[PDB]
Structure formats: structure tokens, C-alpha cells
Design a binder for this molecule. Structure first.
Ligand SMILES: O=C(O)[C@H]1O[C@@H](N2CCN(c3nnnc4c3sc3nc(N5CCOCC5)c5c(c34)CCCC5)CC2)[C@H](O)[C@@H](O)[C@@H]1O
Ligand SMILES: O=C(O)[C@H]1O[C@@H](N2CCN(c3nnnc4c3sc3nc(N5CCOCC5)c5c(c34)CCCC5)CC2)[C@H](O)[C@@H](O)[C@@H]1O
Ligand SMILES: Cc1cc2nc3c(=O)[nH]c(=O)nc-3n(C[C@H](O)[C@H](O)[C@H](O)COP(=O)(O)O)c2cc1C
Ligand SMILES: Cc1cc2nc3c(=O)[nH]c(=O)nc-3n(C[C@H](O)[C@H](O)[C@H](O)COP(=O)(O)O)c2cc1C
Lengths: 643, 644
């Protein structure tokens, strides 16, 4: 009989200094998801308002189903929030990326109850993040829910977890699945019925023990393994708590059956066979709405990612929305989840690392798509590691290892960090953030660097958690690092793909970033407030040419893509032309006359064609075609150049 | 039947915890409050004193508690931000480590052994003042933690840590109309309220009854003995009791004094109609060795030394002080300037804290007759000229103070270099400047002309000197220079500062910075790091510097004679000057028994010259009072005397 009520439709202000004692009448109206940094946090100057803001909404006991207790669930309040019911402080949280709850049954004394939520995203030495290349969008950017449950219920107060913990064990062709639940105010005489359901919902296992036994082991014969995108099979665990034979409360969670390994020489292994993890990272924001994404935004992001053919996503730099982790479960993406422990170690932030890390594991333990827990990102950027940095990490490593025996810990290291720094040796695996070819150096340096690490530390699995290069709507025929041209970014990824994708020992690579994202302190490239290293634009409206370089290597979608479509006016008499395709042969036609048929090891078909007058280019690979136009001109169209 | 229970003994303390402990710690460090974990690392320098989160833990045995309907936890001082847990449950948070706060915890006393965990924190953030000040932010429970047992119906304990009673006297001629306001909680409409106002000897002088529904009464006292400063710090006591039947289920009380005052822009401070020059000192709430974990005797000793000095006012900077110390000022007739730690840099996001601390200051100290001005900020424009956020912040405080307290004025402590035409100076009722001409560059003589120039330009704003001072360690010279840190130059500086300030009646109040040396862990100057050495007495209160006696000469009617330079013995010159302070008219000086001359000092600064030959014994005499010292001729300056 557990019921969930949406509570998203709220008075807001940034000027209050105190909890209002009655419903405000002159405050601005918002419906959640909401953030007050939607505009000021994506235009630059690092001027997005950071402070304390108040939300106000009235909760009428009448317009409510009746249960023994009413909880207020908050899926995301960035960064720190305080909750008042009728003026009385009832709950506080620090961490803008996790779910927390609060039982408010006793505070609903009135017919109409005033719920005020203050949210804060300022500076302080306690709550992460504080130093990162991404806007700390303030507010209630995820749902706010009201949960009505029986007096006896599965746990809602333990670190915002689901109250159920499923752990499959694979014995041969069968699965033995531990389904542990956690109860609150349970009577010794109640029973718990455990059911494991089919992908089509057909009951495959069921058992029944008393409330006293919150753990059970159900067998699944001939279990269909969660084999990622090949076959991302999902079972459904479902526990009901019964009084008499009435079921007063029940919880559930989809789950997946899989084993995996991270061999330091063979790379990632899934269910016994090698499964190369090649993919991208994604931030949880979009142009114009800050980070108040709706479900369709998640759906659209994953669709664009799966269209690219990525088999892994690095979900930096923080815990993402549950719905997006679900999508990754259904689609078969291997995910790297982490906490906002980044850039500089604040000693007084140790508690917050432990707090967020626990919510990360507790709330997401049941996502088959997740295989590693990231402890920190570029944490030694400030300098070499301290004893306090090392202790803070060991504490987290041990805590994760004890809570979850089925996954591995990882680290994302700043490029410059000495490979002999003690902190690299703490977690199971590690990945480096390298920007050779954008932040100086040459893109040819990446391959060698990785190799030379692997020679030094051949038994620590090494990944590339970050690589990328900026790209706006600038174009040139001589791509060069620093021009922000779509072409150079395309050349950069061509070389990166050829270097990384051919090295099996790199257990995972992650393009930074899949999309452009909000970083209000950025002021470069002709458009401020954004990091432009994505393969797709901040509004998900334009796939850059580099997006198709990756489709050529990783997608089973037959396609043909002409690069350069936005670079029309060119001065040279002969011009270079590049086609990306996952098909063997590609023929290019300039104004109807074929310029040749080509194949390519690396799926990058490089043509050279005469540039005379106005020409129309057409790429054909079997039954697939694409269209580009160009035009000779006497001088370079400066509208293409950043200057 | 309200009962207060001390709760300071045996607390488990740690700086290494990461979470609230589930059971009573067995290996933590035992402490008894008042306590601060910065008692050493916060007074030695390096700015390294530990700032973060540390945990206190102690058991509450229900049996040992008296029988009452409700049990409140009270905290007089938790620097800077704290959280309260009762059996792992959170039940209260607070921001501001100088105010009193309480929390009703009856319903979480579910066991016979209840685990109370208070987490205290003094870190870095943009919300809670202070964050940039020249004094240590001592962490921990440095003031009393009490438990209050009261009846279900009781006087308010949840309104910003107030007393639940607000006494406001009005002086109509030779009589006083005393307004008595009390505040209740869960009061039955059929209970009564008995207001009684008693004597300085406790003899009932007025009394009225009313039902719980009338929480405001005006009682008369004719021929009222006014609180007239040091001349007569007369104190009545108000006393309201809540009765159910003729049981008295709860009762509150407060001392108060009835006085009027004015801050005239030309006549200075006026008290009860008569001019009453406010010339005094500032005082910090710390002390060498124990950080800010002060016991009553330390408050007593602190004001005793001030009373010996004869100061008529104290600037209790930079924050709300302890309740005991405000009381003492009430008893001794000192006129007090109180303020909040809104200091140095304006943080936009700290606005809510300025309002909470300022609301707490006024509610928790409205009743102290010694207080006349509420300070809004100290050197708030240091890190720049006044902008709109700073100015809205100040107007908001100014109006709130004026709305809650009609009988007092608001002031500010302006940093020295702040343009006198800053819109910031125009917000409060009065203002004072913090000037260090003669220490932070400049010359001591500049103080007079500067104050004259402001007074010319702004004749209608009462101007005071909220801070002046000069460092002084145990260094000595016969050639005082700004920057040698010598006891001599600091005495010369304060002589000149006295002749300039004490003769200008329009300055409504002067505050020597500071009465005592104090803890400022970021300082590293003078030969002893971790302290500000601008006091007239040293951090441990064991040595009154010469400058101390220069003021006693001007403010004490305790007749005395002081030889300065007692610690400067070996001197090189053949003739040496000898400074004597005395509030008597004539001083004769004797060198080895032979008299070197009588002297009458109008300014009480008796400057003699004497020969320096061999071992000389100096004796100063003013009637029946004498003082002694010793000097010695030497060939070369004693290097032990110079900072070098
Ligand atoms: O940056 C991204 O795109 C993403 O990567 C991660 N981080 C990567 C490293 N990091 C940097 N951020 N900004 N600038 C530089 C670095 S390192 C570096 N090295 C540089 N060179 C110095 C000369 O010699 C060779 C190296 C130069 C610059 C930078 C910029 C100025 C010119 C030279 C912080 C962000 C963040 O997790 C992510 O949130 C962010 O979005
Ligand atoms: O300082 C005290 O003891 C007390 O005074 C008040 N505040 C006064 C000003 N302020 C300063 N603190 N420390 N140093 C300086 C200032 S201003 C200044 N100006 C200076 N030069 C400017 C250019 O020309 C010559 C003079 C110099 C110095 C300082 C120090 C080094 C030498 C030159 C903060 C404290 C505080 O309200 C009080 O909380 C504090 O305890
Ligand atoms: C993924 C996961 C979910 C968990 N969920 C709960 C829970 O909902 N309720 C609960 O009491 N314990 C839960 N636990 C475990 C215990 O809370 C925990 O191991 C132990 O009781 C320590 O509790 P503490 O963190 O409060 O010290 C969970 C553990 C894991 C690994
Ligand atoms: C010095 C002083 C002490 C006060 N103490 C209390 C008090 O203890 N309880 C109370 O209800 N009101 C007290 N008041 C007044 C009211 O709190 C105030 O007029 C009004 O209730 C403001 O409430 P708010 O601060 O919650 O907005 C006090 C006022 C002053 C000036």
C-alpha cells in the first residue's frame, strides 16, 4: 500500500533571509525540477548567484491519502538544504547529488502545513564540490516527493536507500541471489515474502520467512545473464511485508546477473569474454535549463550516446539521477560512478566525502550497469598528496570495499601527477586525465605515455578517464591546436581513436565530453560560460564531426557522413574531403563525377578533390549517401575564423 | 520550581571523529567545561590553530534528574557552529559562537543513560561571522552547558535564548513607570501572573496581578533610585511568577536600572541629565593559557583591574560577551558598548548571520542597564569602500535594532582610512573611528587635528574614538621610537593620546585598545608570537604596564604614585629622565635619599631629570604615598633591552 505523490508544482526567492511564517504571496512561482542558475550559470564571468534561497509550498492533509507516516523525499537539493514544516526545523542535508528523506508525520498538525526548503550553494571548507570545472547549479533540480507508508515499512531513513539489497552469485549456469531487506518498526509476527520476477514478469523464484529474517537466497536456474548491450537482461526482485496475509508495505528493484573482471593486460572482461569499454563522459545539465532536466532529457542523452555506440559512460563528477542509471541498466552500458571529491583536498571535507560515498553505494547498489566506484578526480591538482589526502582515500577505499564486494574502486588522476605518487596505489584500478594535443603537447604523445605507464606498473589496470579538445563553429583548412575549429577537434579524435582503440590493455577510455556543458567560469573560444569539448552541442541540437568518427568505430548502425558541411567557402583550388563510415567502401562524387572509391583501416576516408566554382559532393557507401557543398573563393571568409 | 543543573563535568572530547558515535566513547579525552581545544595552538602564532569539527560526548542519566515536565539543554557559548544529538538523533543546530541557545529534548530522553553528542565547528565559510578578524576563533564549548527543568507551562525558553522577561523603565520626573513584559509557552488561559519589583535590599516596592493572557504590566516606583553610573549603580530586580491556582509553576527574574542618557554631538555623553564623560578601554574574553574558557574569577579579575584603572566605559568587542560579565558592569556602573562580530570584510552571504547574532544580542542583553549602544560592525569597509549590499545589510540591522529597542542607540567602529564621506557613516545614530596614528605609521599628534576636522565637517554626528593603541612588550630604551615595541614609547604614546582625547568633550567615548593583551594566532611580532600586545596589562593579567598608570592618574580617585621605567634599570646617559604618574597635585623625587626637586604636573605626567651615577635608588613622594625604583649607570646599552 506504499504510495508516492509528486510534489513538484512552489514559491521561490533569493532575497529572503528567514523562513517565512506564512505562505508568501509576492515570491516567484516555479515548478520543479528547478534551479536558480539556469541563465546566470551558463553565460560566464563566474558570476552565477551562490547563496541561500527559499522554496515555499502548502501541504493540505485533506488532499492526501492516509498512511501511518508521511515522508518527504528529496531526490536532489544542491548543495546543502534545510527543511522546515510549519516553522520547525526537521531535517538537514549536505550534498546536492543524492536522495534524502525525512518523516514529517508529527509536524502535520494543521489542516494546511507550510513546507519551506532553504537551499544553499556557497563557499565553505566542508561540502564538495568546491573547485571544479562545472557550474554548481543551485536549487531543487530533481523531484520532491511525499511517501505515504504503513507504520511498519521498509527502511526509508538509511542514507536514502531503496530498503532492498540484491546480490546475485553465479554458480555455473545458475544464479544464487541474496535479497536482503531492511525494516522499520516491524512486528516480530510479520512475514516477508520474497519474489524474483522474469523479464516478462513471470515469477521464477519465491520464498517466505518471518520479519526476523531480513535476508534470503533465491535460486535462478539457467539464468539469463546481464550481458550489456549484447543482452542487458534484467530480473525484478520484490519483497512484501505481510501482516496476517495483508501486505502492508512492499519494495522492489530491477537487477542484473553478471560477473566481470578488469585484467591489467586484456582490459575489461564481461561474463567471461573480453568486452572493450570504449565510451564517453556525460554531465547532467542542458543549455537553458541548468540541471533541472526532465526524463526526456535523460532519454535523449542516452539515445544520442547509444546512437554513437558507446559501451561505457563515465558519469562524472557526482551521483546522477536514478532514472538515468535505470536507462543505463536497460541499454547495457558499463558505468563509472563517482563522488565530487575533486581538484583540491579540503581536510574539513573528509566527513562529506564519506557521507556522499555512502549514499552513492547504498542508493545505487542494485544497478547492474555500474562496475567501479570512483573515489576522486584530479585530487592532487593542488599538489602532491598529503597524509590527510592519503588517509581520506584509504578510509573511502576500505569503506567501499566493505560495503560492496562485487565492484572495484578507481581513481581519475590529473595529467601532471607523478605516476609514483603514493595515492595511485590505493584503489584497485586507475585512469588518467590527459589532454595532450589540447592543453599543450601533441596528440601523438598519448599512446606512448600510456604504454610507458603500463611498462612501469604492469599489474595496475590503466584507463583513460578523460581526453578531449575544444570545438565551436569555427572552420579552417589547416587545422591547428588552439583554433577551436570543428576540423582540428575531428583530427584530434581521429588520432586519439587510433591510439587508444587499438590498445587492449587500457581497460576503459572516456571521451570528455559527450556534450558541451555549463562551466560559468569558462571564457574562451567565442562563447562564454561553457566547456566546448563535447561531441554534441550544449542543446543536443548539433552532432559535431567528431561524433561520427566514434560512430564509425563503435556503432552497428550503417551510415555515411560527410565532414565539413559547415565549411563551405574555401580558398584552395584543391580541397581535402573526409567521410566517416562503418562500411567498407565509400565513393565520392563532386558534381556527379566520381573522385575515386576508397577503403580505410580506420574508417576515416580522406579524399582530395578540385575546388572550382560551386560544387556538390556526394558520398555513397552501398545503399547509403550523404551530401556536402563547397565553393571556391578568392580570399578566406573571416566569418569562419575566431579572431 | 524551575531548576538549572550544571552540565560541565566530564565530557569526552576528540578532534579525530568523523561521525556521531553510537555508544559512549571509551578512549576520548576527558574535559570539564568551560573548554576550548585552541587554548595552546591558538595563542602561539603561525595562524595554525586547528579549525574544523570536534565532538563532545557525555551521558545524561534520567534518574539523576529532578522530576519536571520538560528538560531543556542550554548552551551559553559554542564557537562557532554546533549541532546537538540525543541518542544519535539530531535535535538542534546553531550558528554564532557568542550567543545563548537552548533546545527542548524531553521526548528524546527515552533511556536511563542518554548519549548527548554536541559537534562544534569553527571552520572557514561565507555564512557565519567572524571570518576575518585580529583575534583567535577559539573552538569548542567555552561557556556553561546547563540543563533546565521546568513545568509544561513555563516562561519562554525558545525565543533566541532570551530570558522570557523584558523590563523597560520610563522616567517621569522623580518617578519611574516600569514596563514589565513576559513571554510564555503552553500557558493555560486560567493561570495568573504576579509581577513584583523589589528593592536594592529586596523590599517589595510594587506588585500587580493579571491573568496569563496579559503578559505586559506597568508598575510604578516613586522617588526611584536611578542607575547613575559609577556614582551610584543602583539596581532594582523585577520578578514575575506564573501561578496555577496559588501554585507557582515557573518564575523568571532580572536585575535592571532606570536611567536616561543622551549622546550630544558637542557635549559628549550625558547620563541622567548630567555630563558623564565616557573614557575607557576595550576588553577581549580570553586569557593566557586557557584560550576563552573563562571561569567567573577571570571575569571578576578582569573588571577589578578596569575599576582600579577608573574607566567609566568598556567596549566589549568584538562580539557578545558572557552574561556574568555584563552583570558585573551593571553592578559597578560601567557604561557598555556591545557589538556583533560583523567585522573586516562584508560577506553578502553572511547577512542572515548578522541578523541572527544581532537579534540574539539585543534579546539576551536588553535588560543590562550598563549597555547604551549596540554596535553594528567594526572596520567593515577595510576591504573596500561601501557598496550597495554592505549598505542594505547595515540599514537592515539599524532598523531592526531601532524596532526592538527604543531606548538605545546604534554605532559603528569605522576603519581609519575610510573616507569620512562614505555613505556608511550616515546610517547609524553615532559613530567612532579606529585610529593608530603613532603606531601604524603617522604621528600621535595627528589624532587631535583629525578628530577636529571630522567634527567640523559633520557637526551633527556624535564622534568617538572606538580604538586607539600601541604595542608594548618587555623592551626598553631611553630614546622611544614608534616601532621599538618598548614599554616607554607606549607610555609616551598614551600620554599624548590622553592629552589630545581627554580634553575634547565632544568625543562621546574613547576606548583604549586594548585593556589586556589577547590571543591573535596570526600575529608574529614583538618577540612573542600569537598575541596582540597593545594591552595596558599583559595577557596573563600579571603585569600592569606603565601606560596602565597613566590612565589611572586621570580616572581614579584612589590616590597613588607610580614610578615608570622600573624594568629599565641599566642606562647609559649621565642625565636620565624619570616619569612619575600620580593623581595627586605634587610629586617630589629623591635620588639616593637627596631630593632632586618638587613638581606639579597639570597633566599628571611628572617628568623629572636626574643624574645617573653608580647605583641610584629613586623614591617618589606625594604626601603620604611613595614609590620606589632603581637605576644604574653603565658604559654600553644592555642588549637584553632591545628587540634587535
Ligand atoms: O578541462 C576539461 O575540459 C575537463 O577536464 C578536467 N580538468 C582537466 C584539467 N584541468 C585544466 N583546466 N583548465 N586548464 C588547464 C587544465 S590543465 C592545463 N595545462 C596547461 N598547460 C600549461 C603549459 O604547459 C602544458 C600544460 C594549460 C591549461 C590547463 C590552460 C591554460 C593554458 C595552459 C582542470 C579540468 C575537469 O575534471 C572537467 O570538469 C573539465 O571540464
Ligand atoms: O590592530 C589592532 O590591534 C586592532 O585594530 C583594529 N584594526 C585596525 C586595522 N587593521 C590592521 N591590522 N594590522 N596591521 C595594520 C592594520 S591597518 C595598517 N596600516 C599600515 N600602513 C598603511 C600605509 O601607511 C603606513 C601604515 C600598516 C599596518 C596596518 C601593519 C604593518 C605596517 C603598516 C586591522 C585591525 C581591529 O578593529 C582590532 O580587531 C585589532 O585588534
Ligand atoms: C547497498 C547497501 C544498502 C544498505 N541499506 C541499508 C538499509 O537500507 N538499512 C539499514 O539499516 N542498513 C543498510 N545497509 C547496511 C547497514 O546499514 C550497515 O552495513 C551497518 O549497519 C552500519 O551502519 P552505520 O553506517 O549506521 O554505522 C546497506 C548496505 C549496503 C551495502
Ligand atoms: C529584548 C526583547 C526580548 C524579547 N523576548 C521575547 C521572548 O522571549 N519571547 C517572545 O515570544 N517574544 C520576545 N520578544 C518580542 C517578540 O519576539 C517580537 O515582538 C515578535 O514576536 C517577533 O517575532 P519573530 O522574531 O519570530 O519574527 C522580545 C523583544 C525584545 C525587544
Amino acid at each position: 500500500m506504499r504510495e508516492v505523490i509528486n510534489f513538484n508544482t512552489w514559491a521561490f526567492t533569493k532575497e529572503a533571509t528567514e523562513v517565512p511564517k506564512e505562505m508568501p504571496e509576492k515570491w516567484y512561482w516555479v515548478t520543479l525540477p528547478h534551479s536558480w542558475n539556469e541563465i546566470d550559470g551558463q553565460d560566464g564571468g563566474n558570476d552565477y548567484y551562490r547563496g541561500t534561497c527559499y522554496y515555499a509550498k502548502q501541504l493540505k492533509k485533506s488532499e492526501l491519502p492516509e498512511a501511518d507516516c508521511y515522508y518527504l523525499e528529496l531526490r536532489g537539493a544542491n548543495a546543502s538544504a534545510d527543511v522546515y514544516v510549519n516553522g520547525k526545523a526537521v531535517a538537514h542535508h549536505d550534498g546536492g547529488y543524492s536522495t534524502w528523506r525525512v518523516d514529517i508525520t508529527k509536524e502535520l498538525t494543521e489542516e494546511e502545513n507550510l513546507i519551506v526548503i532553504a537551499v544553499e550553494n556557497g563557499v565553505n571548507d566542508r561540502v564538495y564540490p568546491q573547485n571544479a570545472d562545472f557550474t554548481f547549479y543551485g536549487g531543487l533540480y530533481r523531484d520532491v516527493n511525499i511517501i505515504a507508508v504503513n507504520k511498519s515499512h521498509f527502511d526509508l531513513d538509511y542514507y536514502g536507500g531503496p530498503g532492498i539489497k540484491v546480490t546475485p552469485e553465479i554458480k555455473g549456469a545458475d544464479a544464487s541471489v541474496e535479497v536482503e531487506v531492511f525494516l522499520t518498526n516491524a512486528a516480530a509476527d510479520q512475514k516477508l515474502v520474497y519474489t524474483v520476477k522474469d523479464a516478462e514478469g513471470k515469477e521464477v523464484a519465491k520464498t517466505e520467512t518471518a520479519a526476523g529474517e531480513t535476508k534470503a537466497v533465491l535460486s535462478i536456474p539457467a539464468v539469463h545473464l546481464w550481458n550489456g548491450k549484447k543482452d542487458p537482461y534484467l530480473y525484478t526482485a520484490e519483497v512484501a511485508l505481510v501482516s496476517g496475509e495483508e501486505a502492508v508495505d512492499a519494495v522492489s528493484t530491477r537487477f542484473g546477473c553478471r560477473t566481470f573482471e578488469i585484467d591489467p593486460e586484456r582490459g575489461f572482461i564481461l561474463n567471461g569474454e573480453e568486452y572493450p569499454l570504449r565510451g564517453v563522459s556525460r554531465h547532467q545539465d542542458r543549455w537553458g535549463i541548468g540541471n533541472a532536466l526532465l526524463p526526456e532529457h535523460h532519454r535523449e542523452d542516452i539515445d544520442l550516446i547509444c546512437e554513437l555506440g558507446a559501451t561505457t559512460i563515465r558519469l562524472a563528477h557526482y551521483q546522477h539521477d536514478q532514472y538515468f542509471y535505470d536507462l543505463c541498466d536497460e541499454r547495457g552500458l558499463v558505468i563509472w560512478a563517482e563522488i565530487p571529491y575533486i581538484s583540491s583536498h579540503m581536510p574539513n571535507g573528509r566527513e562529506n566525502t564519506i557521507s556522499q560515498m555512502k549514499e552513492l553505494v547504498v542508493q545505487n547498489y542494485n544497478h547492474p550497469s555500474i562496475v567501479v566506484w570512483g573515489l576522486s578526480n584530479e585530487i592532487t591538482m593542488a599538489g602532491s598528496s598529503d597524509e590527510d589526502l592519503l588517509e581520506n582515500h584509504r578510509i573511502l577505499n576500505d569503506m567501499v570495499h566493505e560495503m560492496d564486494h562485487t565492484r572495484l574502486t578507481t581513481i581519475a588522476v590529473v595529467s601532471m601527477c607523478d605516476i609514483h605518487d603514493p595515492y595511485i596505489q590505493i584503489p584497485d584500478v586507475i585512469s588518467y586525465n590527459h589532454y595532450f594535443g589540447w592543453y599543450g603537447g601533441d596528440v601523438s604523445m598519448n599512446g606512448p605515455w600510456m604504454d610507458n605507464f603500463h611498462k612501469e606498473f604492469p599489474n595496475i589496470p590503466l584507463g583513460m578517464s578523460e581526453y578531449g579538445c575544444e570545438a565551436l563553429n569555427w572552420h579552417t583548412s589547416d587545422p591547428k591546436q588552439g583554433d577551436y575549429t570543428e576540423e582540428y577537434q575531428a583530427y584530434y579524435h581521429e588520432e586519439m581513436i587510433k591510439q587508444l582503440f587499438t590498445r587492449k590493455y587500457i581497460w576503459a577510455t572516456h571521451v570528455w565530453n559527450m556534450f558541451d556543458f555549463g562551466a560559468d567560469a569558462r571564457n574562451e573560444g567565442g562563447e562564454n560560460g561553457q566547456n566546448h569539448k563535447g561531441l554534441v552541442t550544449f542543446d543536443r541540437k548539433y552532432k559535431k564531426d567528431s561524433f561520427y568518427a566514434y560512430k564509425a568505430w563503435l556503432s552497428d548502425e550503417p551510415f555515411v557522413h560527410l565532414c565539413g558541411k559547415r565549411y563551405v567557402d574555401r580558398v584552395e583550388d584543391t580541397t581535402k574531403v573526409t567521410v566517416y563510415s562503418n562500411l567498407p567502401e565509400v565513393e565520392l562524387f563532386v558534381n556527379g563525377k566520381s573522385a575515386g572509391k576508397l577503403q580505410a583501416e580506420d574508417h576515416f576516408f580522406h579524399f582530395e578533390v578540385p575546388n572550382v566554382g560551386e560544387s556538390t559532393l556526394v558520398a555513397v557507401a552501398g545503399e547509403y549517401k550523404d551530401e556536402s557543398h563547397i565553393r571556391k573563393v578568392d580570399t578566406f571568409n573571416e566569418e569562419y575564423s575566431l579572431k
